[PDB]
Amino acid sequence: MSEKKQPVDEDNWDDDNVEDDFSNQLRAELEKHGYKMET
Amino acid sequence: STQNRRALDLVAAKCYYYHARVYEFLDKLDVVRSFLHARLRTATLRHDADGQATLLNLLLRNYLHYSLYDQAEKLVSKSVFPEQANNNEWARYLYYTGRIKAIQLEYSEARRTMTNALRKAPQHTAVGFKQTVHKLLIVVELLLG
Amino acid sequence: GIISLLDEDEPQLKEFALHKLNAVVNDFWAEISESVDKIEVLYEDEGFRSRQFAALVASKVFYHLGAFEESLNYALGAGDLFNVNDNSEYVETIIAKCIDHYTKQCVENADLPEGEKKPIDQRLEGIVNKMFQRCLDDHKYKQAIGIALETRRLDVFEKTILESNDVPGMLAYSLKLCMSLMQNKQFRNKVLRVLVKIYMNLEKPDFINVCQCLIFLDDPQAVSDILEKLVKEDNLLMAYQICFDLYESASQQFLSSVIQNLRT
Amino acid sequence: HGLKGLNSKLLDIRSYLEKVATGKLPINHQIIYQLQDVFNLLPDVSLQEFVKAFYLKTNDQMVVV
Amino acid sequence: MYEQLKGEWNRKSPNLSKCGEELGRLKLVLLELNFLPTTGTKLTKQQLILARDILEIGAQWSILRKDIPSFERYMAQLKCYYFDYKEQLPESAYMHQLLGLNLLFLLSQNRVAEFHTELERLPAKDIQTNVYIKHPVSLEQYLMEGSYNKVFLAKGNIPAESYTFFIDILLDTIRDEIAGCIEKAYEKILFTEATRILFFNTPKKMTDYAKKRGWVLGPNNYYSFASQQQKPEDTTIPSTELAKQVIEYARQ
Amino acid sequence: GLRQYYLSKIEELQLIVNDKSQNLRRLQAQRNE
Amino acid sequence: DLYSRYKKLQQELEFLEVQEEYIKDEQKNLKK
Amino acid sequence: GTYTLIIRLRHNVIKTGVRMISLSYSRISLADIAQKLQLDSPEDAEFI
């Protein structure tokens, strides 16, 4: 049986695990070390 | 008592898939709506198997395809009980009835019948509407809980 | 679209909504599934020129609703408009359920034939006899005696074998079925007595199955009378087979209770 | 059947209490303190603490089931 | 036939007898011409559009005299004429505003499911345009947000005649929602926050306080009583079948 | 009208006489072994 | 052909129903 | 062909937001919560 309208052609909680969302994401803490060394 | 009626009803359903394709190749099919209403009326009285579900599936598809009241008209349409639809028409019936439940802010009573409809006939590979039902499926789940 | 035109109290538009009410029940039967208010108010409305006329639409809408009894009541109340509408595909099941309710009521009245019997609506039994008038002489009147059995009536029962279909052996298989499917003796003897009466009424006097049903009717005085009639005929060639029929079937107590009448 | 037996015993002792309190029976001292000795027990099932007794077990049996 | 269509419909409308006269005049319109299927009769939908307009202005006079049981007639007959079974011509200039009124009607009587079941009639006519719908979409999907006061400044600009007849019911609903939201456990807001910050620039709110709930005043505080249920540990009647959830479902 | 009333009973009966009989077959089958 | 077929169908219907009501209680007796 | 859902889910979004606040924060001010709620109505954040 066909009712064709489809265009030719875990993964529930894990996408926002490393995209940019921590202070060490891609750059290695350098985004804060400009203002991290004052202490 | 020769019961060719339901076999010819399946024949009618198969050609009315393409006839509904004709009816979207043209304007509305209200004459066909009256005809299938008469076919339902002569169904459920003398014979009722596998024709009624197909014609009401056509009815739901035509009613959702147009933006009219169309829905609580079905909610009071108390032919809600066609029998075993050989695991094929029943699943798409559950899909239509779940969407037409979701259209008035369903409250997780429709998510379970959406899941049941999805898992009930998944055997075909890219059947034609599986992407649509899967897309609509977890709308209500991300909505509610 | 859904139309609530019947909001107004204007009687002119109450009667003028007849065309609308008739037109909407062709494809939108599920649309009107909540008119318990407007339909009933219009039917009970007094100044009403569509009285006995708008009730057919009520039966139409209740037919989709699954109210097979409310449809029946409004079909009775829909008068001549329902009567003349006896040739349509939808009305077939309506009048079929009407006949089914009528014969269930007939069984109920046959349970107790005196007291607490529901007065049959004259339009209801009018529909019954009218659809019987559709089943008049058109040959094949086996159903004509059949529904006559299930309705427990006797005058139509006599007229069906008396109507101009034929009488070859209709009166024989009528017996065959009546003691084939007899629910109880209380109806079996009732139909048996009118059967044996019309058997005596036939030009050739009845001979064999009159006695066969008579000893199933336990009527020794009647068999004494008819053997006296055969004595008046002054030959026993009819009573020839009758004596052996009594030997084959009649009880010894029946013979011992008819013998003193035979010699009296 | 335990409930039936308990009902039978309670019906007999209310009969006895009726015919001693309002009736021709002596008010002899044997049971007239033993009865409230029985009535002194009557464990206060519904309190703040018995919640942790009941629910902590019932769900464990439900897990096993 | 084609008489006084806008006879008294523009300057004002105090001629209530003329309203009744037009409503009685409508008999030549509806039941004297094909109106139910509207399949044939090509040259009636012009005067059927006129009939729509007469109904709209009549029910607008009825809401000018504030009659809801005729505002049902507002959304009874006229809807399936511009949106008839036979679409013939462009609808009107008023139609989207009329649908905004009907949408606000479905909104104002807490029918959110009946709010949703006709916003889909247009594919894209007012989901990005048509301020006559841009107000109702916020007016609906603002009561689902826990902001409850910029609606009235959004009521400050009205693309229709008043939008106040529904705004009264909006006031009502704000009253009992702020009541039912504060009536639980809380720690005694001062007079001014419950008085001016919501609504009623201290007219009668010191009396409305006793009118609605009570909560007798002490030293300028509006305390909420405790009202925490103890969780009574009986659970025998409602959970004895739950206790029997083996035998009376599994037959053994 | 004999076909429009009396004939329908046949089908209105026959279907049950089909399905229920199958049930009984199963039941007596269930007994047999 | 007509009428009598309906009666014999209904006759074997209650006959079959008698067997159905029988099969339960005989099964219950034969198990124990 | 499912225009409605977005309009009826944005509340659900803020639902999740406040649920996170129900787990994470203990004592957050009425005006100091909405900075991580970006709707920018501290005048309505009290009854948000």
From Swiss-Prot, chain A:
Keywords: Nucleus, Proteasome
Main localization of the protein described in the UniProt heading: nucleus
Pfam family, one: DSS1_SEM1
A GO BP annotation: proteasome assembly
InterPro entries for this protein: DSS1_SEM1
Top-rank taxon: Eukaryota
Subunit structure: Component of the 19S proteasome regulatory particle complex. The 26S proteasome consists of a 20S core particle (CP) and two 19S regulatory subunits (RP). The regulatory particle is made of a lid composed of 9 subunits including SEM1, a base containing 6 ATPases and few additional components. Belongs to the TREX-2 complex (transcription and export complex 2), composed of at least ENY2, GANP, PCID2, SEM1, and either centrin CETN2 or CETN3. Component of the homologous recombination repair (HR) complex composed of ERCC5/XPG, BRCA2, PALB2, DSS1 and RAD51. Interacts with the C-terminal of BRCA2.
PANTHER family: 26 PROTEASOME COMPLEX SUBUNIT DSS1, 26S PROTEASOME COMPLEX SUBUNIT SEM1
Protein name, as recorded: 26S proteasome complex subunit SEM1
Source organism: Homo sapiens (Human)
Swiss-Prot record, chain C:
Family: Belongs to the proteasome subunit S1 family.
Subunit note: Component of the 19S proteasome regulatory particle complex. The 26S proteasome consists of a 20S core particle (CP) and two 19S regulatory subunits (RP). The regulatory particle is made of a lid composed of 9 subunits, a base containing 6 ATPases and few additional components including PSMD1. Interacts with ADRM1. Interacts with ZFAND1.
Protein name per the record: 26S proteasome non-ATPase regulatory subunit 1
Function: Component of the 26S proteasome, a multiprotein complex involved in the ATP-dependent degradation of ubiquitinated proteins. This complex plays a key role in the maintenance of protein homeostasis by removing misfolded or damaged proteins, which could impair cellular functions, and by removing proteins whose functions are no longer required. Therefore, the proteasome participates in numerous cellular processes, including cell cycle progression, apoptosis, or DNA damage repair.
Curated annotation (Swiss-Prot), chain F:
Role according to the record: Component of the 26S proteasome, a multiprotein complex involved in the ATP-dependent degradation of ubiquitinated proteins. This complex plays a key role in the maintenance of protein homeostasis by removing misfolded or damaged proteins, which could impair cellular functions, and by removing proteins whose functions are no longer required. Therefore, the proteasome participates in numerous cellular processes, including cell cycle progression, apoptosis, or DNA damage repair.
Domain of life: Eukaryota
Full-protein positions shown: 19 to 51 of 406
Family: Belongs to the AAA ATPase family.
Protein name from the UniProt record: 26S proteasome regulatory subunit 8
Places the protein is found: Cytoplasm; Nucleus
Record text on subunit structure and interactions: Component of the 19S proteasome regulatory particle complex. The 26S proteasome consists of a 20S core particle (CP) and two 19S regulatory subunits (RP). The regulatory particle is made of a lid composed of 9 subunits, a base containing 6 ATPases including PSMC5 and few additional components. Component of a complex with USP49 and RUVBL1. Interacts with PRPF19. Interacts with TRIM5. Interacts with NDC80. Interacts with PAAF1. Interacts, in vitro, with the thyroid hormone receptor (in a thyroid hormone T3-dependent manner) and with retinoid X receptor (RXR). Interacts with ERCC6.
Curated annotation (Swiss-Prot), chain G:
Coiled coil: none
Reported function: Component of the 26S proteasome, a multiprotein complex involved in the ATP-dependent degradation of ubiquitinated proteins. This complex plays a key role in the maintenance of protein homeostasis by removing misfolded or damaged proteins, which could impair cellular functions, and by removing proteins whose functions are no longer required. Therefore, the proteasome participates in numerous cellular processes, including cell cycle progression, apoptosis, or DNA damage repair.
Protein name (record): 26S proteasome regulatory subunit 6B
Residues of the full protein shown: 39 to 70 of 418
Subunit structure, interactors included: Component of the 19S proteasome regulatory particle complex. The 26S proteasome consists of a 20S core particle (CP) and two 19S regulatory subunits (RP). The regulatory particle is made of a lid composed of 9 subunits, a base containing 6 ATPases including PSMC4 and few additional components. Interacts with NR1I3. Interacts with PAAF1. Interacts with TRIM5. Interacts with ZFAND1.
Family statement drawn from the similarity comment of this UniProt entry: Belongs to the AAA ATPase family.
Compartment(s) where it occurs, according to its Swiss-Prot or TrEMBL record: Cytoplasm; Nucleus
